[PDB]
Design a protein around this ligand. Structure first.
Ligand SMILES: CCCCCCCCCCCCCCCCCC(=O)OC[C@H](COP(=O)([O-])OCC(O)COP(=O)([O-])OC[C@@H](COC(=O)CCCCCCCCCCCCCCCCC)OC(=O)CCCCCCCCCCCCCCCCC)OC(=O)CCCCCCCCCCCCCCCCC
Ligand SMILES: CCCCCCCCCCCCCCCCCC(=O)OC[C@H](COP(=O)([O-])OCC(O)COP(=O)([O-])OC[C@@H](COC(=O)CCCCCCCCCCCCCCCCC)OC(=O)CCCCCCCCCCCCCCCCC)OC(=O)CCCCCCCCCCCCCCCCC
Ligand SMILES: COC1=C(OC)C(=O)C(C/C=C(/C)CC/C=C(/C)CC/C=C(\C)CC/C=C(\C)CC/C=C(/C)CC/C=C(\C)CC/C=C(/C)CC/C=C(\C)CC/C=C(\C)CCC=C(C)C)=C(C)C1=O
Ligand SMILES: CCCCCCCCCCCCCCCCCC(=O)OC[C@H](COP(=O)([O-])OCC[N+](C)(C)C)OC(=O)CCCCCCCCCCCCCCCCC
Ligand SMILES: CCCCCCCCCCCCCCCCCC(=O)OC[C@H](COP(=O)([O-])OCC[N+](C)(C)C)OC(=O)CCCCCCCCCCCCCCCCC
Ligand code: SF4
Ligand code: SF4
Ligand code: SF4
Lengths: 70, 155, 176, 298, 318, 96, 55, 188
């Protein structure tokens, strides 16, 4: 009766599930709900600094729309 | 009381040992072949926690199964000395329990105990693959009943 | 007669060559093994769980010895030393004496369970069915001394497994 | 480059101790000798003692000796091929047969009492007749077995990894193998068409038709097929033995050689006297020397 | 909270490595007409913990002839690489998103051999040196194609970043386009981890235990995780490399469930292969790869560079 | 017992919770099987003791015992014979 | 412990043969473990005359 | 007290006993772990006369067989007395580990012994143990020694590698006895 194999991989299935679950939610939590920004090039990194400077609270994941400008 | 926590840590340690003891790959003679039948799908020793690991550096119980002779007795005791602590030696079969059929010959040590501190004795010629299946489980009860830390907390 | 076993020359036709080339390139006999084990994965395991259920035996099984006694209660062994005379391992050691009643019993019947090899000759030996191995394959002990049985332990085994020995011998007394 | 095989780590003084035991008491020695071909071992010793005694076993005895001697060939060849793959690294084929060869050990115990060491095949015939229903149980297993022997062949015989690990490796030629004192598979594997069951048939092996697989390359691989083919050829022998089992006794009628049954033991003078001396002194065989060899599975 | 993420990527893996041992015992057993561990707790689910405590409370053998400092560095080096080489894996969102993920994949994979190397030397024995040097021979044939297959497959992905692998595999599986490479990658990933037909370095029947002969208790227990954490991670590498699942931008649950199932299916096949085939010979292994594998890699890599240009299907770099 | 079963699993025992004093919750063994049921359990017969009661006699035990190795009830070998050579007891009367 | 027909095909197909015709696990086809008492035969020399040992 | 309760009780008075599991040679051999080897006043004012384990073992056996052991009090001592500094010189030479002696005042060593006593497991060095290393084996010639029983004492020089072969690194593992010279013995 091969069902007994399943409990073994069942907890394992949850075991590998936690990391991907953790990283996605931790990124979602720390970075203001939005998905964590990716900076593979200097243009992205330069873009991130501008967001941080204009945020005022020194946090890139604080985006101010048209209400910021006049 | 410190006795309670010692007993709880006592039960934790031995339960790990009795449910994970690994019989060595140490076969000698007729008594070894049927012990394979214990590892065969019929009785499936592995289901009870044991694995048949070689390399006495990574084994707990030594299944001396077969005729123990003169020319190999140094090899066994060297092997037994290599096994880490704790280590148990189950003398398996009548040959290793005193000499078996060839008790009176000239190149057999009459009993595995004369070289090694021999644990629970399972008789048979050969003991059935089930006969020492109890022999392994009966050792698991011996591992269950030890005190160790209980003596240490009362030493 | 005899049969040749392996010299089968493979054909060199383009169909055969491509079949072998496909076999070597696209591993097939390796996949044949994988499909085999997977089929042999969804079977029913041949294991039996221990003591809750136990393996099957036969009435003539050979195990722990026992010294039975007559229906009256008198022991069967009249100390004829036949079992000692046939013991291949010389495990039997008995001495007799004229008992107080006048009957012919044995003072000592030490059977060394660490010497004898369960030939069963002893149960074939005595003409009164005195010594006989019981069905109890299980008597493993923690110390070497416990295995060296004397007359008293043999009688105790006779008194314990008497139900089995009477039934088993009843089944197989006709085959012998 | 050079391999010195130091042996002696299991030298029980068997041939020394036999000197001190009666012929009946020496029988379990051969049982323990080659502990994977038990019935074949006692068959060798029994034939020698019968030859010296100038006594033949009853027709029923010879048939079950052949029948049980052949499932013994099933046992050893199972052990040889499976542990081969085990030593090579293929663990799965080891376990599948060992469940099946566990079933054959049941037949061992049902007829003798012990799983391995039957001590059943004795000089002058077997100890006692088979239990009722034993032959039917043989038929059920023999039906299933050929459906597992091919299963082994599916696992290894055509496997490329097993082939390379075994093809054209450990190759021994014809003359050197013959000169080296080789026998059995070592001869049949290298092309020499020799088999004691055919050339010098003992017991009733002549009245049984079977083929002897002969290899051509003589290497490690060719012997693996030779052993596996010996499995199937043994199954044919078992099929004939079951179908041609004759009625009759199981030991030589001569009570001075084989012990009388327990029935006449307890009523007749001569039977008890013979049983007494046979189990105390044993049958005195005539002086002389002989060398009897049989086609043991090894 | 980045530290919380680090443990959330270490401890959940560690239990996954632990239960692979129990799963392998049961998978191997049920492929053997056996039952596998089922007495330690229910269904044998407590078995890894039973072995867990025994090993860490087992007598840790120090061999006298061993070089102690190198003796202890090897178990540390083996486990440290195993965990840190999980960090660039793009489980929905990778923990460590780097433009050169696969290069870092190869670097610590190549660093892994020095565990079995230094341990084999430090054990100071015949079987120790035999296992360690055949470990060289096994792994020496191994990086040359491992890089080539990685290069050829990724050449149409766009770059070495692991995150963009999902975008490339958005429409169809990578295995549909490079199945000749996938079989060859799979054998090598089965091979880099010293598993199933290629386990010469351990070689139970022929080297008793190889490098692990003089390694007991935790030093052994550490060696088991490095071997088994590399099994799961390499299969996870193959799962993203060739069977990249769909990724909803708003629900990372979807990819995580699909990705984990792919890793489980692949890891079972590792046990599937481990049960079935026999074990190669380290000369045949080298001959198998540098005489049959490597020639196919070069032409297949030749095909996979010519193909994007000829079809005007080169992938974006950014 | 279940006839529709792979041979070997068709008969099984659920061990007692108490036997001769010792607690036989989770720790159990194979020797706690009384003889009369040992035959039926090991497929030595197809007749349970309830259907066929074994023939009762005086000397048969009324309480089965497990293997008593380890516990202070374990069996110790000892010579069952009498003394062979005694000695000439010296007299009580003095020298003179 | 009978396999579900769904996997009966799986084991049959994956091995390319009909397992259910003949299985390794035994079942009710085995001979009964209790058999009637047998009557064994006598040997050829169980003759109460003309059975002299000299011949 | 025992002599009072059991007048005919043979009292054996062994000196420091050395052997495989002796905690005397191993004590100084294990001293290498904690930096150098600390000896109070370089241990130059403490003379020890150790005795091999087996001789005292045979002494007890011979005492049982001897019908004159009743009431007597034997003092089991070795053949030669060695100043403690030279003894440690001999031990570390046989083990080939470097010797780094350094003085240590008595009050500070007592403090060190106190710290080691804190361990709830087998202590490595107690304040009592520190005192024992300082206690030179008092010579009691009036006390019947070991040769009267019949056992000839085995000099520590012969059977010293037994205890200390284990402590040697792999480098000097196969080194024999004659490699290291016998240490100087302050004799009676
Ligand atoms: C590059 C830096 C190399 C530094 C160095 O000296 O390494 C010696 C080190 C130890 O050599 P060994 O062959 O193990 O022999 C140690 C004993 O001599 C032989 O074994 P042992 O059991 O006698 O070792 C104990 C011994 C020596 O101490 C040790 O073995 C402890 C570990 C090394 C400490 C230095 O302890 C002492 O001497 C007293 C210590 C207080 O040799 C190395 O190759 C280790 C290099 C590690 C570099 C950093 C890696 C990250
Ligand atoms: C892949 C998993 C797909 C979902 C579950 C379906 C499944 O595996 O059914 C196995 C089920 C049992 O194996 P079998 O050899 O056919 O059963 C023969 C006897 O009827 C077996 O007779 P039996 O008396 O052994 O049947 C009783 C058995 C029946 O057991 C079941 O039905 C297993 C499902 C859980 C209940 O339940 C037990 O023995 C109780 C212990 C259960 C152990 C823990 C099971 C964990 C399942 C997974 C949990 C989540 C992960 O096989 C089928 O029903 C075949 C269809 C498979 C569909 C796959 C779809 C993808
Ligand atoms: C000569 O004679 C012989 C015999 O008889 C004497 C025999 O019988 C047999 C027959 C018996 C057999 C079994 C046949 C096979 C046997 C052989 C010897 C043949 C050769 C073998 C092979 C080629 C294959 C060898 C395969 C092996 C060893 C399997 C390995 C894989 C496994 C999954 C099994 C082992 C699993 C283990 C040890 C369990 C997991 C390990 C752990 C360390 C436990 C987990 C630990 C932790 C998690 C660490 C602690 C951390 C925690 C808890 C985390 C939380 C805490 C924190 C602090 C973080 C043979 C063959 C024989 O030849
Ligand atoms: C993760 C594991 C968590 C639980 C670990 C518990 C401790 C196990 C240590 C190994 C066994 C020794 C022990 O328990 O105490 C040491 C104690 C140490 O004191 P001891 O005196 O009992 O040691 C054994 C006896 N001698 C000293 C002669 C070797 O030993 C024992 O308890 C064993 C008896
Ligand atoms: C570093 C240190 C880390 C420490 C972490 C903390 C936990 C470590 C130890 C964990 C196991 C503790 C052992 C106690 C439970 C136990 O094993 O009981 C067995 C014992 C077994 O007793 P036994 O030994 O008599 O059983 C064998 C004998 N037969 C088969 C005849 C019964 O049973 C009980 O006490 C009842 C336990 C039932 C529940 C067990 C857990 C089930 C759920 C598991 C879920 C998955 C977990 C992953
Ligand atoms: S006890 Fe019996 S079966 Fe075991 S090795 Fe000795 S003779 Fe062979
Ligand atoms: S069973 Fe055989 S070997 Fe054992 S005591 Fe009886 S006659 Fe001797
Ligand atoms: S047990 Fe049997 S053979 Fe032995 S003395 Fe008694 S009656 Fe004779």
């Amino acid at each position: 009766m091969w069902f007994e194999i399943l409990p073994g991989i069942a907890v394992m299935a949850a075991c590998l599930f936690i990391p991907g679950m953790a990283t996605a939610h931790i990124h979602k939590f720390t970075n203001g709900g939005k998905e964590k920004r990716v900076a593979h090039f200097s243009y992205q990194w330069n873009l991130m600094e501008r967001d941080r400077c204009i945020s005022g609270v020194n946090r890139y994941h604080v985006t101010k729309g048209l209400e910021n400008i006049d | 009381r410190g006795e309670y926590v010692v007993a709880k840590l006592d039960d934790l340690v031995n339960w790990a040992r009795r449910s994970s003891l690994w019989p060595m790959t140490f076969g000698l003679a007729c008594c070894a072949v049927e012990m394979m039948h214990m590892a065969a799908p019929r009785y499936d020793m592995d289901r009870f926690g044991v694995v048949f690991r070689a390399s006495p550096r990574q084994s707990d119980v030594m299944i001396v199964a077969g005729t123990l002779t003169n020319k190999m007795a140094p090899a066994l005791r060297k092997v037994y000395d290599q096994m880490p602590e704790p280590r148990y030696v189950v003398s398996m079969g009548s040959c290793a329990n005193g000499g078996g059929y060839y008790h009176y010959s000239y190149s057999v040590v009459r009993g595995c105990d004369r070289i090694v501190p021999v644990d629970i004795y399972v008789p048979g010629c050969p003991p059935t693959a089930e006969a020492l299946l109890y022999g392994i489980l009966q050792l698991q009860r011996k591992i269950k009943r030890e005190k160790r830390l209980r003596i240490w907390y009362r030493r | 007669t005899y049969k040749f076993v392996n010299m089968r020359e493979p054909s060199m036709d383009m169909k055969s060559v491509t079949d072998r080339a496909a076999q070597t390139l696209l591993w097939t006999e390796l996949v044949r093994g994988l499909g085999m084990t997977l089929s042999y994965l969804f079977r029913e395991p041949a294991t039996i769980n221990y003591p809750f259920e136990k393996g099957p035996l036969s009435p003539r099984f050979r195990g722990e010895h026992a010294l039975r006694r007559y229906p009256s209660g008198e022991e069967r062994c009249i100390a004829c030393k036949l079992c000692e005379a046939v013991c291949p391992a010389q495990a039997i050691t008995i001495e007799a004496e004229p008992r107080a009643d006048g009957s012919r019993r044995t003072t000592r019947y030490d059977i060394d369970m660490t010497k004898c090899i369960y030939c069963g000759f002893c149960q074939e030996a005595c003409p009164v069915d005195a010594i006989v191995e019981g069905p109890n394959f299980e008597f493993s002990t923690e110390t070497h001394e416990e295995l060296l049985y004397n007359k008293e332990k043999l009688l105790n085994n006779g008194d314990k497994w008497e139900a089995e020995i009477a039934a088993n011998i009843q089944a197989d007394y006709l085959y012998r | 480059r050079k391999c010195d095989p130091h042996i002696g780590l299991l030298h029980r003084g068997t041939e020394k101790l036999i000197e001190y035991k009666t012929y009946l008491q020496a029988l379990p020695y051969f049982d323990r000798l080659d502990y994977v071909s038990m019935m074949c071992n006692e068959q060798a010793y029994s034939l020698a003692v019968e030859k010296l005694l100038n006594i033949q076993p009853p027709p029923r005895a010879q048939w079950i000796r052949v029948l049980f001697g052949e499932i013994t060939r099933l046992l050893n060849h199972i052990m040889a091929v499976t542990t081969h793959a085990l030593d090579i690294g293929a663990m799965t084929p080891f376990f599948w047969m060992f469940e099946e060869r566990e079933k054959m050990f049941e037949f061992y115990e049902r007829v003798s009492g012990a799983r391995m060491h039957a001590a059943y095949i004795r000089p002058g015939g077997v100890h006692q007749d088979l239990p009722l229903g034993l032959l039917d149980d043989i038929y059920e297993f023999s039906k299933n077995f050929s459906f597992r022997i091919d299963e082994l062949e599916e696992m290894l015989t055509n496997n490329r990894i097993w082939r390379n690990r075994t093809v054209d490796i450990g190759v021994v030629t014809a003359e050197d193998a013959l000169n080296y004192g080789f026998s059995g598979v070592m001869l049949r594997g290298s092309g020499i068409q020799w088999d004691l069951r055919k050339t010098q048939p003992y017991d009733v092996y002549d009245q049984v038709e079977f083929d002897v697989p002969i290899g051509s390359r003589g290497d490690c691989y060719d012997r693996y097929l030779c052993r596996v083919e010996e499995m199937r050829q043994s199954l044919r022998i078992i099929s004939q033995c079951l179908n041609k089992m004759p009625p009759g006794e199981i030991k030589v009628d001569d009570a001075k050689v084989s012990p009388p049954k327990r029935a006449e033991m307890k009523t007749s003078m001569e039977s008890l006297i013979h049983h007494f001396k046979l189990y105390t002194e044993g049958y005195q065989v005539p002086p002389g020397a002989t060398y009897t060899a049989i086609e043991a599975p090894k | 909270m980045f530290m919380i993420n680090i443990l959330s990527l270490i401890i959940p893996i560690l239990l996954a490595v632990a239960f692979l041992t129990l799963v392998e015992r049961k998978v191997l057993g049920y492929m053997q007409l056996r039952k596998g561990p089922n007495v330690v707790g229910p269904y044998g689910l407590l078995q890894p913990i039973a072995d867990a405590l025994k090993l860490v409370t087992k007598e840790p053998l120090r061999p006298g002839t061993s070089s102690i400092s190198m003796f202890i560095i090897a178990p540390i080096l083996g486990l440290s690489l195993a965990l840190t080489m999980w960090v660039p894996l793009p489980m929905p969102y990778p923990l460590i998103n780097m433009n050169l993920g696969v290069l870092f994949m190869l670097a610590m994979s190549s660093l892994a051999v020095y565990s079995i190397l230094w341990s084999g030397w430090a054990s100071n024995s015949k079987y120790a040196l035999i296992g360690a040097l055949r470990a060289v021979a096994q792994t020496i044939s191994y990086e040359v194609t491992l890089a080539i297959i990685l290069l050829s497959v990724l050449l149409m992905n766009g770059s070495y970043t692991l995150s963009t692998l999902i975008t490339t595999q958005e429409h169809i599986w990578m295995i549909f386009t490079s199945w000749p490479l996938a079989m060859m990658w799979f054998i090598s990933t089965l091979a880099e981890t010293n598993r199933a037909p290629f386990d010469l370095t351990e070689g139970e029947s022929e080297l008793v235990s190889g490098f692990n002969v003089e390694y007991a208790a935790g030093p052994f227990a550490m060696f088991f995780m490095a071997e088994y954490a590399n099994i799961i991670m390499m299969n996870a590498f193959t799962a993203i490399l060739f069977l990249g699942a769909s990724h909803d931008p708003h629900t990372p649950e979807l990819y995580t469930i699909n990705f984990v199932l792919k890793t489980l299916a692949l890891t079972i096949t590792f046990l599937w292969i481990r049960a079935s085939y026999p074990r190669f010979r380290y000369d045949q292994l080298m001959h198998l790869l540098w005489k049959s594998f490597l020639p196919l890699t070069l032409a297949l890599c030749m095909w996979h560079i010519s193909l994007p240009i000829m079809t005007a299907s080169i992938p974006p770099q950014s | 017992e279940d006839n529709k079963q792979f041979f070997g699993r068709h008969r099984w025992v659920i061990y007692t919770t108490e036997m001769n004093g010792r607690d036989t919750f989770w720790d159990v063994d194979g020797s706690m099987v009384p003889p009369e049921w040992h035959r039926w359990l090991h497929c030595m017969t197809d007749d349970p003791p309830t259907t066929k009661p074994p023939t009762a006699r005086k000397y048969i035990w009324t309480n089965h015992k497990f293997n008593v190795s380890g516990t202070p009830q374990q069996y110790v070998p000892y010579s069952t014979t009498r003394k062979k050579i005694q000695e000439w007891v010296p007299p009580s009367t003095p020298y003179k | 412990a009978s396999a579900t027909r769904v996997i009966q095909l799986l084991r049959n197909w994956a091995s390319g043969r009909d397992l259910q015709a003949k299985l390794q696990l035994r079942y009710q086809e085995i001979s009964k473990r209790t058999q009637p008492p047998p009557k064994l035969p006598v040997g050829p020399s169980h003759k109460l005359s003309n059975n002299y040992y000299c011949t | 007290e025992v002599r009072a309760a059991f007048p005919e009780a043979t009292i054996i008075k062994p000196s420091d006993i050395f052997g495989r599991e002796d905690r005397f040679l191993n004590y100084f051999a294990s001293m290498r772990w904690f930096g150098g080897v600390p000896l109070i006043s370089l241990g130059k004012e403490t003379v020890k006369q150790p005795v091999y384990i087996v001789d005292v073992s045979k002494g007890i056996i011979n005492a049982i067989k001897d019908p004159d052991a009743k009431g007597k009090t034997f003092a089991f001592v070795g053949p030669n007395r060695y100043l403690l500094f030279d003894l440690v010189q001999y031990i570390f030479a046989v083990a080939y580990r470097p010797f780094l002696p350094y003085p240590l005042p008595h009050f500070a060593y007592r403090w060190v012994g106190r710290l080691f006593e804190v361990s709830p497991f087998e202590p490595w060095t107690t304040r009592d143990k520190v005192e024992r290393v300082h206690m030179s084996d008092m010579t009691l010639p009036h006390l019947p020694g070991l040769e009267d029983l019949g056992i000839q004492a085995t000099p520590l020089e012969l059977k010293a590698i037994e205890v200390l072969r284990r402590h040697r690194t792999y480098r000097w593992l196969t080194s024999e006895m004659e490699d290291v010279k016998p240490a100087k013995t302050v004799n009676i």
